[PDB]
């Protein structure tokens, strides 16, 4: 009852991607993202639950203060209403060579907070802390908020105090964790381009949505997973919910006679 209406709702996500909205910023480093992988990303997501993907890219030769998001890696994840359960291993592949980790991208069911949320601050921080390769070249968290018929993009970098609090947020997971502040994340200028195409990276098995496979997620989250260059599968794809397609045991024969004639 819950998921079925959500699956049919995914169909109108493509109309959402066509009309996007990027939040401007009055500040005093620029990031560019190829529309192709972003539109495909929005279409792949769910209407109610968060979907995430690691960011990789590099700075062009002409401009070293600009970094292009060359790839979006899909990892085995269990979506949440306000959070996302990510693994503690990075994707290794030949396609990522010459590229650098640039945070992660995820969508938001409810409307966006004009500040870096405690969830994004905690996940981004602990991802920066746990992974050595993650902290050096500055990374950011990109949120793709959903508004009926539109999409709002925001880019938040992690502040020093935000990092110290995020990792140290041992626990309170909530909308107002003890110690949280609206000034733990500063926004970054994000831009969209149709000049170049970015590529994708999904798990070699092909399955990244372990929501309908939560029992199987625990047996891979703390292990190194292979990644292959391919196209990402939809959230409610058949592979993500193979249990739904499992055959019952109702009568397999057919008590109605009719000739096909077409052999």
């Amino acid at each position: 009852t819950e998921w079925r209406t959500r699956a049919i709702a995914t169909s109108n996500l493509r109309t959402r991607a066509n009309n996007m909205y990027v939040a401007p910023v009055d500040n005093d480093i620029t990031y560019v993202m190829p529309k192709n992988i972003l539109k495909k990303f929005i279409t792949i997501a769910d209407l109610r639950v968060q979907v995430a993907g690691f960011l990789y890219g590099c700075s062009p030769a002409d401009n070293d203060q600009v970094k292009e998001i060359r790839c979006i890696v899909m990892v085995p994840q269990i979506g949440g209403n306000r959070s996302v359960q990510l693994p503690q291993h990075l994707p290794q592949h030949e396609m990522l060579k010459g590229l650098e980790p640039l945070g992660l991208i995820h969508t938001m069911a409810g409307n966006e907070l004009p500040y870096m949320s405690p969830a994004d601050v905690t996940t981004h921080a602990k991802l920066v802390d746990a992974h050595p390769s993650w902290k050096n070249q500055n990374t950011l968290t990109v949120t793709v908020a959903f508004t009926p018929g539109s999409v709002s993009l925001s880019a938040w970098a992690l502040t020093p105090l935000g990092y110290k609090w995020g990792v140290e947020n041992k626990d309170p997971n909530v909308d107002n964790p003890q110690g949280f502040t609206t000034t733990m994340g500063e926004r970054r200028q994000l831009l969209l381009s149709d000049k170049f195409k970015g590529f994708f990276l999904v798990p070699d098995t092909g399955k990244w949505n372990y929501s309908f496979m939560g029992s199987s997620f625990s047996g891979i989250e703390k292990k190194p997973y292979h990644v292959k260059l391919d196209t990402p599968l939809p959230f409610y794809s058949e592979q993500h919910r193979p249990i739904h397609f499992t055959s019952f045991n109702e009568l397999e024969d057919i008590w109605v006679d009719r000739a096909d004639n077409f052999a």
Binding site: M95, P242, H244, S247, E250, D257, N261, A263
Partner: protein
């Protein structure tokens, strides 16, 4: 009768026959005399007494011995035929006319059809050569599968002695056409045969059908009728239009309008049509028609039950007989039987008590009830029975036998038993006449064909004289069945229903291109004849009384039908012109049998961004399910069902759409369905999904939508194999238990972890010790493809890619058949669009072979802002979860440098000829004042500066005069230095030679322009003999190899290189080599030398110009559209996966294209194969025959040309030229060629059809040049390689004859996915890269010999002067260079040279690599250098030889040569080939040229008569002698040896090993040598002594009379005294010349009528295993012992006469 314009538009829906199958067009129901009617409470009864015909008036049966001995076999069981077959016999066996027999069911009608087959066997049988199994096909069409299977059974067993194999057309196996080509007397259903012919994939075999039998042809009345009409119509359509005889036989039931059906089959009434009334029925039939009068439903059903009950008492109690009752439902057969038993228990022990008498009721009923597994056998022991398709084979067979035994008194069964086996249970009852049809989605009345077959199965023929058929329906339906069981129900046509789709199918096959063609096609239907005899009944309109042949009516019909086809975008239709042309959408609709409305919704709803749920939605919106309603009686069941299906359908709620969607899902997921109407509708959706999904599949495919197409394909596999894509693939294995499948689907394991493993390690992987052994076999047989792709940036705009597909599984005919189909998909980075796709077949032969590496070449577009990667996927077409995907990264790819704009053509003065400063040179072209514009822009550097110049203009631009302006200037100066011109092929060198030789014989300066032949002995000084020479890149390679020590090789100031772009064409590397050195030549001598190069418009001329060293000022590259005569190009994309079927398909369009663009102008048609020239010419003439103007392309009466009757050596060309066509191919004789060129240019013939292999040799030109096909079959790799761009340019270069428009026109017919490849490089210049790096060793092995490659580092320098080096920097990735920088480039050269030279190290050629791995040319490489033998062949020449030469093995060694592998290999010439092996002595690959060369040489040995195409025999002869003369030079070393010199002796004179030498003399047939043997004429010496005047006892009286030859015997005597030479060469210690002459005053190479186109080698001595020793010889020798023996003689090629005197 031609009338084009229509006057009234009509609505087809308004004319369609509602009540179709149940149509009753008779207002009168004639009834038998004894007909009576009784009335009862609730129902009526009409009894009809049976006719009697025991007294057959004036006829009996014909004896089986009447037939010939070869046709009396299959009638084994019967000692004589039947009178039903007796009257038909004379026409059925002794005439080839169409037939139509109307006889009662079970009267032995099949025997009549067998005569028609046996007669066709007679046309294919002779006293000798009988049992011809590959020259005829027979088609038997049955309405149902149960019939085709039984007819396959008896025909197969009865025709067994004939060795002919019967089969039923079905499934994908024969969808892959294997069984249609291998089996004869093919049996199938109407739909399957129609869809098979619609696809036209097997058109090559469909032309072999001489006979077609239509059983149950009265099915025309049913909705399936239009299928029979669509078949018979098109058949007779061409059968009487083209002339090709096709016989049609009709097997129908006794019904009205049989005369109309007769005229429909074009049958002669007097001898063709026969009618047998019910009196000819096996057993007389008494008919009961019971009509229930109850109004309400429930009361009717109960009434029927009671009536069936009471009838059971009267037909088993009153008169004890078996009782077959038919019902229309599985679950009903049990209820009806149970009701009869249960309700019978009014203590009515009767029949129950009466059947109990024997010990049977105590046993068999009890004994049989326990053995079987079928439940509901609670009523079996009561003498009741049940028979439906749901029954197991064991149970149904038991019931059938028990009933035949008589142990079953009452058998209730469905229609399955009515069409399956034969029971005739005496009395038959049909309880109710209502059935549910999911199609119409309602409760329609029973089908008449079902009724006839039911009641037709009446009383026992031999046991009963009484046939009692009882039919229980409703009172309102009585008159219908009375009209059916009494020959009253007329057979009408339902064509109006499927008229639109039938016309669509006819337009797709090309059988209908015009509206008049549609009217013509409609004239051969059954609807047409019924409209003729019954204008009012079919409502013609009465407006067509003045319409003679109902043409205007047919025009209005075809118009409206084409209109709806036009508005649906199925066909492209012009209203007023009348012409039509089917589109790609219409093709799919025809190939899968789908309505136009359904196709319309698909084309308007399917978009690239669709998912799974939406695709299911579009599926449910099909027009085939628009009648299926959602009844409230089942809504509660669907709701709970809709909320548990895999794919959410919640978008639709309680609509017919949601029902159809949930049904298809339910069937796949196996859900619960209880409603009878529900289960019926689900089955209908299931049996339609298979074709619906594939239709959407090809729609997504042709629109290039990757994601959607892949989803559609998975759905196809879903419905076909019945499973979800995530289910266990083991379901696709019939021989697989359900237990392991059930266990597998509960395993959290991917399908990827099943492969490459042993049974043990898999047993615990799936948790079953038992399946460990079997599962490993199943997975191993699963189609697994491992691919490896290599990319080559052909252009900065387009990408060329080479795909290598290698099978990774084991074959099983049960699961794979003979061929496995695949799909090659290439997606972009997004994977949203398809950049390329094409079907990939995989035959069992190539797959099983040790070397199974399959390769396929194709191209794909590229955006300069190149995306990260592409996607190449190879997917199975029928197997699910059998995909092989490969990411094609581009981060390594480096695009070639951009191309500068072509040298724009400036508009200056025309520059008249007088500007040359001479009037004598004006004789060049006297007719026209100013010459071609191209040279008016290049002349100022052409005949001025003596530096290099390169011109690049399109073919036929007025191109060759460029070099002329280079020679005219060069030969107008003092001390005219010698010159040399080089064309790519011999065809071109002697073509422009024949022009410049005779047209330019003027010696004023230039004189004696000679043509290089090849032999170095004559050309070495013929170059010094003449002022200029024309040669090929090959003979200019062997010659001038050493440049330092030659006389005239330096003085060449002017060197011409025509068609330099062909350097990239195969064997063009030899062109690149010679051109590369020549530039290096003029550098060392410091002398000034010009090298002009002529070629087509090139993409980049910067590298070629620098290759010749010419600055930008004098380098001209024009756009490929500055051609003087504008080329109007027309491309036609064709979508057919069969090469042959594609050629016949293009036959029509080519005939049209010629008549559209060149009605008064000449036209040429290029064809892939030499053989295809004869066929295409034949298909073209037949096309003219169909339009009724066969001599369309003949513009003069045959009498003016008939003088060239037998002057044409080839018969096919004579018949073709007889109607105004004619062709041209390489196997054509020069004589025939002269006749063609004369008859073409003189305007006798209008169209020519040349081969592709003759594109260069062809001196012809025309207004329209069509390119039929762009692929040729290469037997080397067993593929269909695409045309080289160079060819298409040359072939269109023949279209230089402009029209009144002033613009030439050409058409290019190619496969669909090859369009944007040819259309691109035809709009822009031609790009070409060298292929030297592939064939380096060939270039090296020759270069090593010329003392220029002793260092190998000079090879580094040598490469620099090659076009290969210049391009490697500009386009690195193309060749394999991964590092653009210099150090990386030199690194690549170092690796390659040390790799290829290493290849020459592994094979017998110098090796050492110390103080430089430097190498001097070895013996093998040396001889290979002068004769240009491939090292691949020479590596084959060194390995095979053994301790003993063994002779005849060397001939195998000769045929193992690689030079023969490049031979044309037409597929179906294997039969005759193997036959020649049966007529010749002596593990060869059959399809290989190796075996073909071996056999053809065998033929040359016996001088066997070979077919025209086997001129390949001549090809092998031409080059082998020079190659074999090297084979002996190679075998000079080691021991023996020189047997090949005897072998060369064999081939030169066409002789055997050591047969009579008289075979060499003119004539002298093998019988004449017998006449020579009986007399003293053994060898020729005694022949000449037995021929001369005074001797041979003066003809031994007369010997010349004993010899067959009389006159012209001097030609034989001439060879003996004059041609056959005489010896003149004459024969010094224990240890430490003269001249040929005879007679006198003699000037005479060799007598060679057998062969198309030396004095050195001698040998000596022998001991034990023998050795060798090849103005005397200096033969200095160190030896142990002493000896003296023989020396040999010359004779490089002469039969016998080989002295070995010591």
């Amino acid at each position: 009768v031609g009338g084009l314009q229509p006057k009234k538009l009509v609505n087809l829906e308004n004319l369609v026959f509602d009540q179709g199958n149940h149509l009753m067009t008779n207002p009168r129901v004639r009834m038998p005399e004894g007909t009576t009617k009784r009335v009862f409470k609730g129902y009526e009864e009409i009894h009809v007494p049976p006719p009697k015909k025991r007294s057959d008036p004036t006829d009996q049966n014909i004896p089986v011995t009447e037939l010939p001995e070869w046709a009396r076999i299959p009638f084994n069981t019967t000692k004589t035929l039947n009178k039903i077959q007796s009257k038909c016999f004379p026409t059925a066996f002794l005439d080839d006319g169409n037939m139509l027999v109307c006889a009662p069911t079970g009267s032995g009608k099949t025997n009549v059809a067998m005569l028609t087959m046996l007669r066709e066997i007679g046309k294919n049988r002779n006293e000798k050569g009988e049992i011809d199994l590959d020259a005829f096909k027979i088609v038997y069409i049955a309405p149902l599968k149960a019939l085709v299977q039984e007819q396959v059974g008896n025909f197969g067993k009865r025709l067994e002695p004939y060795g002919i194999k019967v089969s039923e057309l079905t499934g994908d196996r024969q969808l892959t056409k294997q069984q249609i080509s291998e089996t004869q007397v093919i049996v199938t259903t109407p739909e399957k045969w129609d869809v098979i012919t619609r696809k036209a994939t097997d058109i090559s075999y469909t032309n072999l059908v001489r006979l077609i039998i239509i059983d149950e042809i009265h099915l025309l009345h049913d909705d399936r009728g239009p299928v029979l009409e669509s078949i018979v119509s098109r058949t007779i359509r061409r059968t009487e239009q083209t002339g090709e005889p096709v016989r049609i036989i009709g097997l129908s039931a006794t019904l009205p309008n049989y005369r109309d059906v007769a005229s429909f089959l074009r049958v002669d009434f007097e001898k063709g049509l026969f009618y047998f009334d019910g009196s000819y029925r096996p057993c007389p039939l008494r008919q009961e028609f019971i009509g229930v009068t109850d109004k309400k439903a429930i009361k009717q059903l109960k009434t029927m039950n009671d009536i069936t009950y009471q009838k059971v008492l009267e037909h088993v109690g009153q008169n004890r007989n078996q009782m077959l009752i038919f019902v229309h439902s599985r679950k009903e057969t049990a209820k009806t039987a149970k009701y009869i038993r249960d309700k019978a228990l009014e203590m009515d022990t009767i029949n129950q008590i009466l059947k109990h008498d024997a010990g049977t009721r105590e046993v068999l009923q009890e004994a049989a009830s326990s053995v079987n597994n079928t439940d509901l056998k609670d009523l079996l022991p009561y003498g009741f029975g049940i028979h439906h398709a749901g029954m197991s084979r064991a149970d149904r067979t038991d019931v059938e036998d028990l009933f035949a035994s008589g142990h079953i008194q009452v058998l209730v069964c469905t229609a399955t038993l009515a069409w399956g086996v034969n029971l005739p249970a005496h009395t038959v009852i049909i309880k109710g006449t209502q059935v549910y049809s999911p199609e119409k989605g309602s409760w329609v009345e029973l089908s008449p064909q079902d009724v006839l077959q039911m009641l037709g199965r009446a009383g026992r023929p031999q046991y009963d004289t009484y046939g009692e058929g009882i039919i229980i329906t409703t009172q309102g339906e009585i008159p219908y069945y009375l009209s059916l069981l009494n020959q009253q129900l007329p057979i009408e046509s339902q064509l109006v229903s499927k008229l639109v789709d039938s016309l669509n199918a006819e337009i797709v096959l090309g059988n209908v291109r015009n509206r008049d063609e549609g009217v013509e096609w409609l004239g051969y239907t059954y609807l047409f004849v019924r409209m003729l005899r019954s204008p009012g009944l079919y409502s013609v309109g009465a407006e067509y009384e003045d319409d003679v042949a109902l043409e205007q009516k047919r025009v209005d019909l075809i118009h409206s039908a084409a209109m709806v086809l036009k508005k649906s975008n199925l066909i492209k239709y012009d209203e007023k012109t009348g012409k039509m042309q089917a589109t790609e959408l219409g093709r799919i609709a025809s190939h899968y049998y789908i309505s136009h409305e359904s196709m319309d919704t698909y084309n308007k709803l399917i978009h690239p961004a669709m998912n799974d749920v939406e695709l299911f939605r579009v599926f449910a919106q099909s027009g085939e399910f628009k009648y299926i309603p959602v009844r409230q009686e089942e809504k509660l069941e669907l709701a709970k069902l809709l909320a548990r299906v895999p794919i959410p359908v919640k978008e639709s709620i309680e609509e017919p759409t949601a029902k159809i969607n949930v049904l298809l899902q339910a069937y796949i997921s196996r859900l619960k369905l209880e409603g009878l109407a529900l289960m019926a509708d689900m089955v209908y959706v299931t049996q339609s999904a298979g074709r619906i999904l594939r239709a959407i599949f090809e729609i997504c495919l042709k629109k290039g939508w990757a994601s959607v197409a892949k989803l559609a394909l998975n759905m196809c596999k879903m419905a076909e194999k019945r499973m979800w894509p995530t289910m266990s693939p083991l379901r696709q294995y019939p021989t697989c238990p359900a237990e392991i499948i059930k266990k597998a689907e509960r395993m959290d394991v991917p399908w990827s972890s099943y492969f490459d493993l042993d049974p043990p390690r898999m047993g615990e992987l799936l948790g079953m010790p038992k399946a460990g052994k079997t599962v490993c076999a199943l997975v191993s047989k699963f189609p697994r493809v491992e691919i490896q792709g290599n990319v080559q940036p052909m252009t900065r705009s387009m990408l060329r890619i080479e795909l290598t597909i290698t099978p990774n599984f084991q074959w099983d005919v049960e699961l794979h058949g003979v061929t496995e189909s695949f799909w090659i998909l290439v997606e972009d980075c997004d994977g949203e669009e398809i950049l390329f796709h094409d079907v990939f077949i995989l035959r069992k032969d190539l797959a099983e072979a040790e070397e199974n590496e399959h390769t396929v070449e194709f191209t794909v577009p590229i955006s300069e802002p190149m995306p990260p990667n592409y996607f190449i996927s190879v997917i199975s077409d029928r197997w699910m979860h059998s995909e092989t995907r490969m990411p094609v990264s581009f981060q390594k790819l480096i695009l070639p440098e951009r191309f500068p704009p072509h040298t724009e053509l400036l508009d200056l003065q025309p520059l008249p000829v007088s500007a040359l400063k001479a009037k004598d040179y004006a004789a060049l072209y006297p007719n026209w004042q100013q010459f071609n514009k191209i040279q008016t822009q290049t002349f100022n550097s052409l005949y001025n500066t003596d530096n290099n110049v390169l011109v690049a203009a399109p073919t036929g631009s007025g191109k060759t005069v460029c070099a002329e302006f280079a020679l005219l200037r060069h030969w107008a100066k003092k001390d005219a230095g010698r010159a040399v011109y080089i064309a790519p092929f011999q065809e071109l060198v002697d073509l422009r030679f024949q022009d410049w030789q005779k047209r330019l014989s003027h010696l004023r300066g230039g004189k004696e322009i000679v043509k290089l032949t090849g032999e170095t002995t004559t050309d070495l000084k013929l170059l010094e003999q003449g002022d200029l020479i024309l040669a090929t890149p090959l003979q200019w390679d062997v010659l001038s190899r050493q440049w330092k020590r030659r006389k005239n090789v330096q003085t060449v100031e002017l060197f011409i290189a025509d068609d330099l772009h062909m350097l990239g064409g195969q064997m063009g590397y030899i062109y690149e080599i010679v051109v590369s050195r020549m530039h290096f030549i003029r550098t060392q001598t410091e002398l000034p030398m010009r090298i002009v190069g002529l070629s087509v418009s090139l993409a980049n001329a910067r590298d070629i110009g620098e290759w010749i060293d010419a600055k930008k000022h004098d380098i001209y590259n024009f756009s490929p559209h500055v051609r003087p005569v504008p080329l109007e190009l027309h491309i036609q994309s064709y979508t057919i996966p069969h090469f042959p079927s594609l050629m016949l398909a293009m036959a029509k369009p080519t005939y049209l294209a010629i008549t559209q663009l060149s009605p008064d102008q000449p036209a040429i048609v290029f064809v892939p194969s030499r053989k295809q020239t004869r066929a295409t010419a034949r298909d073209l003439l037949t096309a003219c025959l169909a339009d009724d103007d066969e001599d369309r392309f003949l513009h003069v009466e045959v009498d003016q040309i008939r003088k060239l009757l037998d002057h044409v050596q080839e018969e096919a060309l004579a018949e073709a030229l007889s109607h105004g066509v004619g062709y041209y191919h390489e196997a054509l004789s020069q004589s025939d060629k002269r006749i063609v060129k004369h008859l073409y240019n003189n305007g006798a013939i209008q169209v020519l059809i040349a081969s592709r292999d003759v594109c260069w040799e062809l001196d012809f030109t025309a207004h329209l040049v069509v390119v039929m096909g762009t692929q040729f079959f290469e037997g080397k790799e067993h593929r269909y390689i695409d045309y080289p761009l160079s060819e298409v340019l040359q072939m269109f270069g023949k279209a230089l004859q402009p029209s009144k428009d002033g613009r030439s026109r050409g058409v290019l017919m190619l496969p669909a996915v090859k369009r944007e490849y040819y259309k691109k490089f035809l709009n822009e210049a031609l790009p070409v890269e060298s292929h030297l790096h592939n064939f380096l060793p060939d270039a090296f092995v020759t270069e090593i010999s010329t003392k220029m490659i002793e260092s190998g580092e000079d090879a580094i320098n040598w490469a620099t002067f090659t076009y290969f080096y210049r391009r490697l920097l500009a386009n690195p990735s193309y060749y394999g260079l991964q590092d653009p920088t210099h150090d990386g480039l030199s690194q690549y050269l170092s690796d390659l040279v040390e790799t290829t030279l290493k290849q020459l190290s592994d094979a017998r050629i110098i090796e050492m690599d110390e103080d430089e791995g430097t190498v001097a040319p070895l013996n093998a490489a040396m001889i290979a250098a002068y004769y240009n033998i491939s090292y691949m062949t020479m590596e084959m020449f060194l390995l095979s030889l053994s301790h003993k030469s063994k002779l005849r093995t060397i001939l195998e060694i000769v045929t193992a040569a690689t030079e023969f592998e490049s031979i044309q290999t037409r597929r179906h010439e294997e039969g005759i080939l193997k036959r020649i092996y049966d007529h010749v002595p002596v593990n060869p690959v059959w399809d290989s040229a190796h075996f073909k060369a071996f056999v053809l040489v065998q033929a040359h040995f016996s001088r066997m008569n070979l077919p025209i195409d086997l001129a390949k025999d001549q090809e092998v002869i031409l080059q082998k002698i020079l190659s074999l003369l090297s084979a002996i030079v190679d075998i000079l070393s080691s021991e023996g040896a020189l047997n090949a010199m005897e072998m060369s002796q064999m081939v030169v004179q066409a002789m055997w090993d050591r047969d009579s030498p008289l075979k060499q003399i003119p004539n002298f047939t093998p019988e004449v040598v017998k006449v020579a043997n009986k007399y003293g004429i053994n060898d020729i010496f005694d022949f000449m002594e037995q021929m001369n005047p005074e001797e041979n006892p003066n003809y031994a009286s007369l010997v010349k009379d004993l010899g067959l030859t009389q006159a012209q015997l001097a030609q034989a005597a001439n060879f003996t005294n004059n041609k056959y030479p005489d010896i003149t060469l004459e024969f010094d210690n224990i240890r430490a010349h003269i001249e040929r002459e005879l007679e006198e005053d003699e000037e005479p190479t060799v007598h060679a009528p057998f062969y198309p186109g030396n004095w050195w080698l001698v040998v000596g001595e022998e001991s034990t295993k023998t050795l060798l020793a090849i103005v005397k010889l200096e033969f200095v020798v160190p030896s142990p012992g002493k000896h003296d023996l023989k020396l040999f003689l010359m004779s490089d090629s002469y039969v016998g006469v080989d002295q070995d005197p010591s």
